[PDB]
Amino acid sequence: SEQGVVEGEIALTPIQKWFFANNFTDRHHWNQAVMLFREDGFDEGLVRQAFQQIVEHHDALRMVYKQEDGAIKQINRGLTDERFRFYSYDLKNHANSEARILELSDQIQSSIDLEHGPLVHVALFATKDGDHLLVAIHHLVVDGVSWRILFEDFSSAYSQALHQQEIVLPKKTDSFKDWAAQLQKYADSDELLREVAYWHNLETTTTTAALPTDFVTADRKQKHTRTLSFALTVPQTENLLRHVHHAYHTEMNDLLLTALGLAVKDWAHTNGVVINLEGHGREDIQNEMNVTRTIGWFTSQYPVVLDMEKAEDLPYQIKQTKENLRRIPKKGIGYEILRTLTTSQLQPPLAFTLRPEISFNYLGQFGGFTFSPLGTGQLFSPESERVFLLDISAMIEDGELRISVGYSRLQYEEKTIASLADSYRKHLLGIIEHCMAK
């Protein structure tokens, strides 16, 4: 892994190709953001010095996207242009802090220039009760794991800055340019060709059953998106984290998907649902690649087929799903590589016919700052089109496993969604109390 400054054109990864093929409205407004807080406040001269080193260290944050001849070309720029856009607000005397911060946050969320950059927007909101720091980055160069690297490096860069040290960050891992270059070689490799029989077997043995909606609409705009969330108590979560795993020796994704399949069964009255599960995507694509400290959009999407044939036997149900995901090779990273990067007609005719309507994503459990209670503002454009009928996220914060279901109000009433969420909880509690008795 080189430690210099990476420049030049990079190839579009499958998750990047999937973003452009959707043809979103205002595709420049499609970000991920976090809002930080510090009671004693931030120093803007130190925040700028930290981000000046972060964007120089992580070369993927200097990316721009050009639409020449209709095709899209992403170039990793050098240290010649601006590395980030900064916003400074002095709201120490203002009346309403939340309504003013949220209003300014949304404007910063929608002002990302994709062709000329920069893709990183940093906003500092100074109030009478501390300083709020908003960090909004376009989703094309960041994902969940990349944000954990950001929290580590920024907390270290800001620490070295106040101690009047020259900011020294850990050694660079493989660049995002090297990953995408190796991704095409692994795409045309023969190890990936050994997966075609599995994905082809999956696409032919499944029976599609459309999920019921309260209403039918052709308006998939993001402005109609609402979220219904439920959380578990911190004794229920630690039981799920420390006392229920090694009875079946499962992982987090096994128990969360088992209770999800039974929830859809008690809610939509089905026995088979195809879920669009998302993985970290930092798997072994040969060449001994290392992307532990690499920031980028590595998200891998692949359909998972849940079976609710016999929901009475919960022991048989958990073992059914646990062994269902073990059958998947390399965490499904090879699925969309086969439909976006592979340059050969695969000997078994793979058609990619599975169209999942539910998306699942487990973000994981979430040291110098603190996270602000304020929101980040609208992350997508209000005119942006919805891709999935239901977006189900899962994260652990403050010792509480908190599930969130995203839906459109033009398709579901909040009561229909609340039934699926209450059915999802009555199975999560049933699993932890069943796995703790074993």
Report on the architecture of this protein.
The chain is of the alpha+beta class and 438 residues long. The protein has a domain at 178-437: Nonribosomal peptide synthetase, condensation domain (Chloramphenicol Acetyltransferase, 2-Layer Sandwich), CATH 3.30.559. 34% of the residues lie in helices and 21% in strands. The protein is built from 12 helices and 14 strands. It is globular and about 60 Å long.
Span between N and C termini? 47 Å
Q: What Rg do the Cα atoms give?
A: 23 Å
Biggest beta sheet summary: 6 strands, mixed
Architecture per CATH nomenclature, i.e. the level-2 architecture of one domain = 2-Layer Sandwich
- Overall spatial form: globular
Helix content: 25-40%
Strand content: 15-25%
The helix count comes to 12
Instruction: Kindly state the number of beta strands.
Output: 14
Using the coordinates shown, work out and report the CATH topology of one domain.
Chloramphenicol Acetyltransferase
What is the H level of CATH, i.e. the homologous superfamily of one domain? Nonribosomal peptide synthetase, condensation domain
Lateral arrangement of strands in the main beta sheet: 8-14-13-11-9-10
| Structure classification | alpha+beta
**Element order: H for helix, E for strand:** EHEHEEEHEEHHHEHHHEEHHEEEEH
Q: Regarding CATH, which class of one domain?
A: Alpha Beta
